[PDB]
Amino acid sequence: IKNGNDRVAALLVKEGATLNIENAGTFLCTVVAKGDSDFLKRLLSNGIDPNSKDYDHRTPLHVAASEGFYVLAIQLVEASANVLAKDRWGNTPLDEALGCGNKMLIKLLEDAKNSQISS
Amino acid sequence: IKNGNDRVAALLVKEGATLNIENAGTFLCTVVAKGDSDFLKRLLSNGIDPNSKDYDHRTPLHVAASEGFYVLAIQLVEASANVLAKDRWGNTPLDEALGCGNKMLIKLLEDAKNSQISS
Amino acid sequence: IKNGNDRVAALLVKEGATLNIENAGTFLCTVVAKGDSDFLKRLLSNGIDPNSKDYDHRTPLHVAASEGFYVLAIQLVEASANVLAKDRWGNTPLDEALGCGNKMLIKLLEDAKNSQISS
């Protein structure tokens, strides 16, 4: 995945494979902080849990919402990631995005909240 | 570049190579609308002009600002892209970003405008 | 250090060895989650700065106070790395320690914070 061998990774999952990551809660969050999109997208298709919680109970949705990243949150909401979660002190990912201030992200967060409400 | 073989892509640059495409301004903004970042990043590594204008006098800055790609905005301005340009009818990229409404992008646009003012 | 052999580490640092690691703030706060006191105790012997912060600008003091540790907090307090630093959530580590509880360790943390504030 890391070295751009997406073609090779197709055979491994076809024959049966799954990456195992220690500190997966913060490993996903660190990638979000980096800003790379292709690397994040490729690992998401491998079955990694988008709702992985770090040591401080922080889903990767918070990092994208806090940093204001828009495209990086499109894949996350496309993987049926939870949007009604809470932080260590208690903060919804939609509320965190609204707290920072982003009109474009507010509509996307509202649609995600509506989808979660509809279930 | 398209296949991601940056190992061979950098080899041709050292031996002497460049991107020879038609309608550079139109090609760049279409990639921005797609949202891919790694492919966009590798394009700028070859020295492509980030201020190439499309058929309607639209720099790639307008597309990123209008849509709201915050991560792509940093990459575009990292190549000394012009920020005081105008659209066909007349609209600065900072004004276009401000018109859509984005507090995070406004600060980034203001810093870009300050850098252009400082020159 | 990971292999528990400090004899080599003492010789290496004597020759002018510097402990530099990528995203040191993230690594310095995930260790306290596992409770590896022995690994952390020898970590401070190499002069690595314990004031580093993760992507959320949370020092290891913040997570240690949230985790509710007494022995681990004592060692980190002795390092004298800040007293009350604002995080992304805006909560001071002293407030987090008081909110968590542990009056046996809260008083020690408050006394350590008061000593650091006095200096």
Swiss-Prot record, chains A, B, C:
Source taxon at top rank: Eukaryota
Localization in the cell: Membrane
Annotated ANK repeat ranges: 1-21, 23-52, 56-85, 89-119
Induction and repression of expression: In roots, strongly inhibited by 2,4-dichlorophenoxyacetic acid (2,4-D), abscisic acid (ABA) and benzyladenine (BA) treatment or by potassium starvation.
Tissue: Expressed in root pericycle and xylem parenchyma, and in flower at a lower level.
Record's comment describing the protein's domains: The segment S4 is probably the voltage-sensor and is characterized by a series of positively charged amino acids. The pore-forming region H5 is enclosed by the transmembrane segments S5 and S6 in the Shaker-type (1P/6TM) and contains the GYGD signature motif which seems to be involved in potassium selectivity.
Function: Highly selective outward-rectifying potassium channel. Involved in potassium release into the xylem sap toward the shoots. Assuming opened or closed conformations in response to the voltage difference across the membrane, the channel is activated by depolarization. The voltage-dependence of the channel is abolished by internal or external acidification. May interact with the cytoskeleton or with regulatory proteins.
Family: Belongs to the potassium channel family. Plant (TC 1.A.1.4) subfamily.
Further comment: Loss-of-function mutation skor-1 leads to a reduced shoot potassium content.
Subunit structure: The potassium channel is probably composed of a homo- or heterotetrameric complex of pore-forming subunits.
Protein name listed in UniProt: Potassium channel SKOR
Organism listed in the record: Arabidopsis thaliana (Mouse-ear cress)
Portion of the parent chain present: 622 to 740 of 828
